[PDB]
Structure 1
């Protein structure tokens, strides 16, 4: 099951809207690098160039969005889906205590660059919390994700 659902595709469209800072529809290794190094990982220009040339139809260096979804495509493992979603949560959860505070969302929002006020992040947590205990857990993420 390499293909994705239409809803998954739309939410990735939102994600690319976050990569596509200027909104031109195209991105070259520079932005992938800036955001990805910002989000904890450390890549090298060589393999990002490799991936681009994997999904560069014209070899121009810029990546269209469908090529971006395609560059995600992979023969994954069935358990790999939950594995990567949990790695994502840990990316959101720096301490790895299973619950995101105001401060952790604060820091992640700062790193990705969306400018938020400290009341807005509290509102974010309170709106994402179906159980309403005051801080978010995992199945809460999933029910937010598919929603």
Structure 2
């Protein structure tokens, strides 16, 4: 499957829910801005609206799941994925040492709306640590952020 699967749709819904923090079924400029700040970007008002406008098929000013899914499923050009992942690493690696610690991971995840347990943080670190050196580096993060 290059094709859209039920599993993929369910994963995209889980991602949608991370944006739609009030659970009302639509992502507002306020909700999009909050997630972007958690990931280290402070978008302007017009950037948020201009971005929403490009995918806002029904013209209501906010993004519903159908619109989000269409965006995520699309066969695309210039997705900015590699560069966005590179940039996102910076909020994880807050001390700039090139590695994401357990504490660092826990901090970003809390900002994204989690309350992860110690076991989950430790498991997330261990899973990413494919070279087995005890730590999580940039290339390891990249593999997790395309899993």
Corresponding pairs, count: 147
Stretch of structure 1 that moved more, 137-146 or 100-109? 137-146
Task: Tell me which moved more, 63-72 or 88-97.
Answer: 63-72
Tell me by how many angstroms 1:61 deviates.
Answer: 2.1
Shift of 1:7: 8.3
Q: Which residue of 1 aligns with 2:138?
A: 138
Displacement of 1:10: 6.3
Matched, 1:115 2:87: no
- 1:11-90 alignment runs, 5 A limit: 11-68=11-68, 81-90=81-90
Q: TM-score, structure 2 length as denominator?
A: 0.72
Find the aligned partners of 1:54 and 1:9 in 2 and give their Cα distance: 21
Q: Is the 8 A contact 2:40 2:90 kept in 1?
A: no
SS state of the match for residue 78, structure 1?
coil
Higher strand proportion (structure 1 or 2): 2
Tell me the CA shift for residue 28 of structure 1.
1.5
Cα deviation per residue 1:76-117 (whole Å; 9 max; x = unaligned)? 987954333221222321222221011211210121120123
TM-score (norm 1): 0.72
Q: Note if contact 1:125-1:135 (Cα within 8 Å) is conserved in structure 2.
A: yes
Q: What root-mean-square deviation, in Å, do the aligned CA atoms of Structure 1 and Structure 2 show? A: 3.7
